[PDB]
C-alpha cells in the first residue's frame, strides 16, 4: 500500500514464494523433508537467499532434517551447543569449510559472536577469526545454521543483529491455511487446479512457453533446403500455437478465476477456523493432565480420516452436504480419538470446549461471550459485605449465586421472579432439575435453542451446582448431537482402531490408573484377530534385552509385541522412542505398551503414541466381581 501511495510501479498480485524460486528448486525441496506449505516454502526460500546465517525455530524438527538432506552432498555434520565436543567441531567446520548445523541455541555460547558477524582479520593470505584461544582460518565454504526446538525463547539483541530468523512454528493462521488448502484439494479439486494455475501464470508457464521456443530455434535453422521435407514442420510450430493461446486465455481469465477461488474458499473457511481451534485446544490439553499430549500428526491424521476415509460421505455429491458432513465428522472423530485417551472426568470438559468452538463457528448464533464469561468467572464478581439479601427458600450460598447472576442484564429480574414462583421449591429439591429448569431470564426477543441451553446452564450453576455436569451434558447434546458423547459410554473397540487408525510405527500406549491391568484387553484382541503376540514383562535388565530381541524379530516379521509395566523404565522408554523413530516396520507389526499413569513416562513417547486410558468401572458390584475373579 505504501508503494502504491508513492506511484512506484509493482505487480498487483505478487506471490513471494513464486517470485523468488523456480519450480525445480521447489520440487527439490519437496523431495527433501519440506512440509509443503506457503509458510514453509517462504522459510525454505529464506534458507537460500540469506546473507547472514539463519536461526531456524522449528518445534516440529522438520527443518533440521530438511537442512540435513539439502546439504548432504556437502557433508554437513550435526552438533549442539550442549555437546561437550562442540567447540572443536565448530573449529573444524570453520577451518575446513564444511557446512554445519548447531542445535539448542537457547543456550547460545558467546564465542560464536564474531563468526556470525564475519569479523575476518586479514594478514597476508591468512584470514584469521578469533575463537577462544585460537585464531582459525575461515574457509570459503563454511556455512552455519543455528536451530531451536524451543519456540518460546527470548534471544539477546546482540544475537538478533547477527542472525536472520526463520520461524517453522505452527500458529492459528498457518494451520488455518494448511487445512483450507487440504479441503480445497480434497473436495473441490477443480478450484485447486485453478489456484495452482493462478500461481503458474508467473514464471512457470511463460518459462515453458519460451523453453519450447528454444527447441523451435534449435530445429529452425537446421536447414539446407530440407525445411520442406513434407511441408509439415508446422506441427512443431503448432505445438507452440496451442499453448500460447492457452496461456493467453488464462492471463485474460485471471480476474474471474481469482474472484471464483476467493468466493469458493470463503465458503470452506469456517471449517478451517474450527480445525485450527480444535488443534490448539488439543495442544492446550497438556495443562489439564500430563498424559493429555497430542502431536500435530494426531490432528492431521484425524483430518485425513475425516476427509478421505469417511464412510458417511459415500454417495453424496452436493458440496454443501459434504461440507456439513465433514464438519460434523470432524467434531465427532476428534472427540472420540481424544477422549479414548482421557480420564472419564475430563470427557465433559473437552466436549464443552468443542461445543464452544462450534458455537464460535456456527452460523446465526451470537457468541454469548458475556454469558460464558459469567459462567467461568461469575464468582469473580464482587458482593459487598451485607449486600446479599435473604430470599425465601434459598440458602446463603444460593443467595450469593443469585446476586452474582443478577449482574447480567437478562437475569436482572431474577430475584423477584424467584420469590414470586410458587413451584420453585419442588424444582429446587427435584432429583433431575436440569431437565425442567424454569423460565426466569428476561428476553427482548425469543432465544435460540442454544441460548436457552446456556441460560439454563447459568441457572443450574446458580441454584443446583451438583447437577451442573448433567446440565453441561445437555448443552453438549444441544450443540453437538445426542449420540455425540454416547460412543465413549461403551466398551472399547480396539479391533477397528488398531487395524485402521494406528500405523505400525505408532505404539499403542495403554495407560491404566494404579492397581488396574489392561493387558487382558490386548490378549483378547490378539485372540480375536488370530495374530501371534509376544508378551514381555519389563522388570529387570534382562527384560530390556528380551524386548529388544522380540521387537527386532517382529519389526521384520510383522508380529505383535506387548511390553507390560513399562513405567518402571523411563530412560529405556526414551531409548525405545528414539529407536522407534528410525524403524521401517512391517504393515502388520504392532507394539503395545501397557503402563500405569505416572508422570515419569516421557512426554515425547506420549506425544508420539496412541494413548488409551483404562479405568475400573465404579461400583461395589464390579469390585467384588474383580476380587472373586482374581
Amino acid at each position: 500500500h505504501h508503494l502504491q501511495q508513492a506511484n512506484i510501479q509493482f505487480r498487483t498480485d505478487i506471490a513471494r514464494t513464486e517470485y523468488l524460486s523456480n519450480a525445480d528448486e521447489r520440487l527439490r525441496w519437496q523431495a527433501s523433508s519440506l512440509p509443503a506449505d506457503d509458510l514453509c516454502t517462504e522459510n525454505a526460500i529464506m534458507l537460500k537467499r540469506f546473507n547472514r546465517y539463519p536461526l531456524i525455530i522449528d518445534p516440529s524438527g522438520q527443518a533440521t532434517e530438511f537442512i540435513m538432506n539439502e546439504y548432504k552432498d556437502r557433508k554437513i555434520t550435526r552438533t549442539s551447543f550442549l555437546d561437550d565436543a562442540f567447540r572443536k567441531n565448530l573449529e573444524s567446520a570453520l577451518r575446513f569449510g564444511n557446512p554445519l548445523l548447531v542445535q539448542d541455541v537457547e543456550s547460545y555460547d558467546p564465542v560464536l559472536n564474531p563468526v556470525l558477524n564475519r569479523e575476518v582479520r586479514r594478514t597476508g593470505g591468512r584470514v584469521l577469526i578469533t575463537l577462544g584461544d585460537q585464531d582459525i582460518d575461515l574457509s570459503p565454504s563454511f556455512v552455519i545454521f543455528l536451530s531451536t526446538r524451543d519456540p518460546t525463547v527470548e534471544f539477546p539483541p546482540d544475537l538478533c543483529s547477527r542472525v536472520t530468523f526463520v520461524n517453522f512454528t505452527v500458529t492459528r493462521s498457518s494451520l488455518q491455511s494448511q487445512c483450507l488448502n487440504e479441503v480445497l484439494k480434497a473436495e473441490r479439486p477443480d478450484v485447486d487446479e485453478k489456484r495452482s494455475d493462478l500461481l503458474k501464470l508467473q514464471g512457470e508457464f511463460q518459462l515453458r512457453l519460451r523453453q519450447l521456443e528454444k527447441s523451435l530455434l534449435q530445429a529452425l535453422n537446421e536447414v539446407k533446403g530440407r525445411i520442406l521435407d513434407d511441408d509439415t514442420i508446422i506441427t512443431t510450430l503448432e505445438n507452440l500455437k496451442r499453448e500460447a493461446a492457452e496461456v493467453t486465455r488464462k492471463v485474460e481469465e485471471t480476474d474471474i478465476v481469482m474472484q471464483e477461488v476467493e468466493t469458493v474458499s470463503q465458503q470452506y473457511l469456517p471449517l478451517s477456523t474450527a480445525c485450527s481451534s480444535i488443534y490448539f485446544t488439543m495442544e492446550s490439553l497438556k495443562q489439564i493432565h500430563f498424559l493429555y499430549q497430542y502431536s500435530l500428526q494426531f490432528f492431521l491424521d484425524i483430518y485425513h480420516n475425516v476427509l478421505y476415509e469417511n464412510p458417511n460421505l459415500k454417495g453424496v455429491t452436493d458440496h454443501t452436504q459434504r461440507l456439513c458432513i465433514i464438519t460434523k465428522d470432524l467434531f465427532q472423530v476428534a472427540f472420540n480419538r481424544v477422549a479414548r485417551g482421557m480420564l472419564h472426568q475430563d470427557h465433559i470438559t473437552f466436549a464443552m470446549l468443542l461445543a464452544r468452538i462450534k458455537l464460535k463457528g456456527t452460523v446465526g448464533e451470537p457468541t454469548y461471550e458475556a454469558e460464558f464469561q459469567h459462567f467461568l468467572r461469575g464468582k469473580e464478581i464482587v458482593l459487598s459485605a451485607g449486600s446479599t439479601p435473604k430470599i425465601p427458600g434459598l440458602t446463603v450460598e444460593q443467595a450469593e449465586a443469585v446476586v452474582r447472576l443478577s449482574c447480567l442484564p437478562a437475569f436482572k429480574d431474577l430475584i423477584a421472579k424467584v420469590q414470586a414462583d410458587e413451584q420453585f421449591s419442588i424444582w429446587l429439591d427435584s432429583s433431575s432439575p436440569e431437565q425442567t429448569v424454569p423460565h426466569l431470564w428476561s428476553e427482548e426477543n425469543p432465544a435460540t435453542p442454544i441460548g436457552q441451553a446456556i441460560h439454563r446452564l447459568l441457572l443450574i450453576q446458580a441454584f443446583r451446582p451438583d447437577r451442573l455436569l448433567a446440565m453441561a451434558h445437555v448443552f453438549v447434546s444441544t450443540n453437538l448431537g445426542e449420540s455425540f458423547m454416547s460412543i465413549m459410554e461403551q466398551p472399547l473397540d480396539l479391533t477397528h482402531i488398531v487395524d485402521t487408525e494406528v500405523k505400525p510405527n505408532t505404539p499403542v500406549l495403554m495407560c491404566s490408573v494404579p492397581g488396574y491391568d489392561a493387558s487382558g484387553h490386548v490378549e483378547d484382541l490378539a485372540a480375536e484377530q488370530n495374530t501371534q503376540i509376544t508378551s514381555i514383562a519389563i522388570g529387570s535388565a534382562e527384560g530390556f534385552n528380551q524386548a529388544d530381541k522380540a521387537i527386532n524379530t517382529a519389526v521384520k516379521s510383522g508380529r505383535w509385541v506387548m511390553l507390560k509395566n513399562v513405567h518402571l523404565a523411563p530412560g529405556w522408554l526414551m531409548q525405545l522412542e528414539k529407536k522407534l523413530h528410525s524403524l521401517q516396520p512391517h504393515a502388520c507389526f504392532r507394539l503395545f505398551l501397557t503402563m500405569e499413569i505416572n508422570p515419569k513416562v516421557p512426554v515425547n513417547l506420549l506425544r508420539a503414541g496412541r494413548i488409551f486410558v483404562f479405568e475400573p468401572p465404579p461400583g461395589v458390584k464390579a469390585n467384588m466381581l474383580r476380587t472373586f475373579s482374581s
Binding site: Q5, N7, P110, G132, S161
Partner: protein, 630 residues
C-alpha cells in the same frame, strides 16, 4: 597526586592521623571518584614513618596476597618472646593499602577469606605460619582500606566481627565550594600558559562547577544506569582544555569559551540517551556561558556546529564540517581497500562518533565506553579510528579455563608494548569476552592510575626495569632509580595505552555484570551510540543503492506523498522515492514490533544490520532479476 587542600581533605586527614595513632584499621567508603584513594595516599605519605604498600583487591584475592606482600616488604625474626614479623626498614610503620576491601568474593557460606585473615591479624595481633604451623606476631604492620558502598553491584558487605574493629568514614562528593576551590587552583595553573586570560580563570571555574552541578541535579542513575557524575568528569574537563591549550601560543576569551563548551558537550552530551536531554544540555551550556561570561557575543564565541579536529591542521583548532567530511570520506575510501573490504557510509551521526573517538584517543588516560544498540558502528568505528590514528589494536581472546593469570600476562604484554616500546595501543574490549566480571576489576586500576601494582613482581620487575631504562635512553632521558623509572613507565602507559569498551544497553541482566559497576562508568568517557535516525537510514540507503539503475524519466510524482524523511528532495525523483520507501520498510517494521510488544507477544530486536541486510538483498535481487530479463 598530592591532593589540592580542600575542606573534606583536611577533615579526613585529621581523622586519618587520629585513628592511625591507635593503629586501628581505617576504612573509607563513598561513591566512585569521590577522592578517597588520593586523600588516603597523600595523608599516608605525608607522615614520615609510614611506608605505604599499594595492594588492590579483586574477586580472586586471598590470604596469599597478604602473605606475599609480607614476604616482599617484611621478614620473620626469632625472639625469646616468639617469632615476630617486622618490616625490613627499622623504625618505619608499614601500612597496607587495600583499595577495594569489599570486592573479594564470598565463599559458598558467605565469608570472605582475606577479610577474616585481616580480622585475625588486627584483633589477635598475628597469624599462624602454615608452613611451620607456628604463631607469629605483627610488630609494625597496619591496614587502611578504601571502598565503594555495598549497594553497588560488584561489592559485598563485610563481616560484622571485622567491621567492629574498623572505623568507617563516608567520603561524599566535594560539593560546590570544594569543587570551586580545587578547580580554581587547577585552572589558575592551566591559564598560566596564555598570560592574557588569567583574569578569566575564576569566572570559568564557577561555570565548570555550576553546569556540572546542574547536570548532577538533572540526570540521575534512575533514568539510566550510566548517568553518573563525579569530580573525575571535572578533571577530564580540565585535562581536555589543557590539551587543547598546550600547543596553542595564544587565545582570545571567546576561543576559551568555545573550547569549554566543546569539552562540556563531549563529556556530558555524549552519555545522554534521549534527544530532548541533549537539547537541554545544548541550551544550558549557552546559558551558563552567557551568565558567567557577559558582554561576549555568542555568535562568534559558540556556534552550534562546534567541531575541533587535528587532522586538517597540525594544531588542535576549530574546523568546518565540510572539510572534515571530505577528509574522513577520503580516508574511509582508503580504509575500504586497506584492512577490511566492506562499504561504510558516512552520515551525520557517524562522523560525530569518529570525532569523539579521535578526541578520546588524543587525551591522556583516554578510555572510551561506547554503549548503544547492537550494530550501529561500534567495534567498526573504533577499529577505523584506531587505524586512522596508527594505534595497533589489541583484543583479548578469552578461552575456557582462562584464569586470571592469563589476563595478567596479556596485560603485562600490552603494558610492556605501550610503555617500554612507546607503541600506542587501542585496547578494545567487547561484552562477549567480558562475560566474567572477576577480571574487570583488575582493569579499573589501569583506567584510574595507568599502573596495576603486582603485575611485574619478581624477575619480571627486573626485565621491565631493563627495558624501561632502554626506552628512556631512546627518548633521551637518563634515569637510574627504579622508582623514577617506574613512574616514567606509568606516565608512558598513561600517554599511550587506551581502552575502548563496547557494550549494549542495560539488557544484560542475566550476565554477572547486570549493570556494570559505576566505577567503570566513571573511569571511562561514555558515548551513547543510539540507533540510526530517519536521515541516517536514508543516507546509508542512497549510497548503497546508487549503483542500481533506479531512474525513471516518466515518474509521475503523487499529488500527496507519505514521507519518513522530512528533508527529502522535492519534487522527489524515482531514486529518492525508492530510498524513502526502503526507509518506510524499516519504520513500519519497528512500529509492528512495538505493536507486538503492546499485545504481549514475543518481540525480536530490530537493529541497523537488518537495514543493511535488506539493502544488500534488494541490490542483489535487482541485479539478478534485471540480468534474467535482459
Amino acid at each position: 597526586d598530592v591532593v589540592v587542600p580542600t575542606l573534606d581533605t583536611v577533615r579526613h586527614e585529621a581523622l586519618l592521623y587520629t585513628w592511625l595513632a591507635e593503629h586501628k584499621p581505617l576504612v573509607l567508603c563513598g561513591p566512585p571518584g569521590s577522592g578517597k584513594t588520593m586523600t588516603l595516599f597523600s595523608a599516608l605519605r605525608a607522615l614520615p614513618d609510614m611506608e605505604v604498600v599499594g595492594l588492590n583487591f579483586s574477586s580472586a584475592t586471598t590470604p596469599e596476597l597478604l602473605l606475599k606482600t609480607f614476604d616482599h616488604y617484611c621478614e620473620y625474626r626469632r625472639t625469646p618472646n616468639g617469632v615476630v614479623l617486622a618490616p625490613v626498614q627499622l623504625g618505619k610503620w608499614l601500612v597496607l593499602f587495600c583499595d577495594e576491601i569489599n570486592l573479594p568474593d564470598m565463599d559458598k557460606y558467605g565469608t570472605q577469606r582475606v577479610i577474616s585473615f585481616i580480622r585475625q591479624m588486627v584483633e589477635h595481633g598475628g597469624f599462624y605460619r602454615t608452613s611451620d604451623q607456628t604463631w607469629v606476631k605483627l610488630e609494625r604492620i597496619q591496614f587502611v582500606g578504601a571502598c565503594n558502598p555495598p549497594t553497588d553491584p560488584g561489592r559485598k558487605p563485610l563481616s560484622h566481627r571485622f567491621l567492629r574493629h574498623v572505623p568507617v568514614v563516608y567520603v561524599d562528593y566535594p560539593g560546590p565550594a570544594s569543587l570551586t576551590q580545587i578547580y580554581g587552583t587547577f585552572n589558575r595553573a592551566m591559564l598560566r600558559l596564555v598570560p592574557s586570560l588569567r583574569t578569566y580563570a575564576e569566572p570559568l571555574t564557577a561555570a565548570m562547577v555550576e553546569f556540572y552541578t546542574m547536570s548532577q541535579e538533572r540526570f540521575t542513575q534512575d533514568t539510566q544506569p550510566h548517568y553518573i557524575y563525579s569530580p573525575r568528569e571535572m578533571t577530564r574537563w580540565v585535562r581536555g582544555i589543557f590539551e587543547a591549550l598546550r600547543p596553542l601560543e595564544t587565545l582570545p576569551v571567546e576561543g576559551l569559551i568555545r573550547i569549554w563548551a566543546h569539552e562540556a558537550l563531549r563529556l556530558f552530551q555524549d552519555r545522554l540517551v534521549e534527544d530532548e536531554e541533549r537539547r537541554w544540555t545544548d541550551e544550558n551550556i549557552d546559558l551558563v556561558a552567557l551568565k558567567h561570561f557577559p558582554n561576549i557575543d555568542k555568535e562568534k564565541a559558540m556556534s552550534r556546529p562546534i567541531l575541533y579536529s587535528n587532522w586538517l591542521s597540525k594544531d588542535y583548532i576549530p574546523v568546518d564540517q565540510e572539510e572534515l567530511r571530505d577528509y574522513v570520506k577520503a580516508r574511509l575510501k582508503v580504509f575500504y581497500e586497506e584492512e577490511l573490504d566492506v562499504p561504510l557510509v558516512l552520515f551525520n551521526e557517524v562522523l560525530d562518533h569518529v570525532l569523539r573517538i579521535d578526541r578520546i584517543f588524543r587525551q591522556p588516560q583516554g578510555h572510551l565506553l561506547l554503549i548503544g544498540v547492537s550494530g550501529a558502528g561500534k567495534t567498526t568505528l573504533s577499529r577505523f579510528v584506531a587505524w586512522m590514528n596508527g594505534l595497533s589494536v589489541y583484543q583479548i581472546k578469552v578461552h575456557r579455563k582462562y584464569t586470571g593469570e592469563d589476563f595478567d600476562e596479556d596485560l603485562r604484554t600490552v603494558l610492556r608494548r605501550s610503555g617500554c616500546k612507546n607503541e600506542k595501543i587501542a585496547f578494545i574490549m567487547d561484552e562477549s569476552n567480558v562475560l566474567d566480571s572477576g577480571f574487570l576489576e583488575r582493569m579499573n586500576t589501569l583506567l584510574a592510575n595507568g599502573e596495576v601494582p603486582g603485575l611485574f613482581e619478581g624477575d619480571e620487575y627486573a626485565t621491565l626495569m631493563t627495558q624501561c631504562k632502554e626506552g628512556a635512553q631512546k627518548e633521551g632521558l637518563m634515569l637510574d632509580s627504579h622508582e623514577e623509572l617506574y613512574k616514567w613507565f606509568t606516565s608512558q602507559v598513561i600517554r599511550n595505552l587506551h581502552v575502548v569498551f563496547t557494550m549494549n544497553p542495560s539488557s544484560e541482566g542475566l550476565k554477572d555484570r547486570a549493570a556494570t559497576s559505576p566505577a567503570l562508568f566513571n573511569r571511562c568517557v561514555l558515548n551513547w551510540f543510539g540507533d540510526w535516525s530517519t536521515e541516517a537510514l536514508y543516507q546509508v540507503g542512497k549510497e548503497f543503492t546508487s549503483k542500481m539503475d533506479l531512474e525513471k524519466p516518466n515518474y509521475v510524482v503523487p499529488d500527496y506523498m507519505p514521507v519518513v524523511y522530512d528533508k527529502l528532495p522535492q519534487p522527489p525523483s524515482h531514486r529518492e522515492a525508492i530510498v524513502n520507501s526502503c526507509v518506510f520498510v524499516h519504520q513500519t517494521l519497528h512500529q509492528a514490533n512495538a505493536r507486538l510488544a503492546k499485545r504481549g507477544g514475543r518481540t525480536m530486536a530490530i537493529t541497523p544490520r537488518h537495514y543493511l541486510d535488506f539493502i544488500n538483498h534488494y541490490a542483489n535481487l535487482f541485479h539478478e532479476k534485471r540480468s534474467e530479463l535482459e
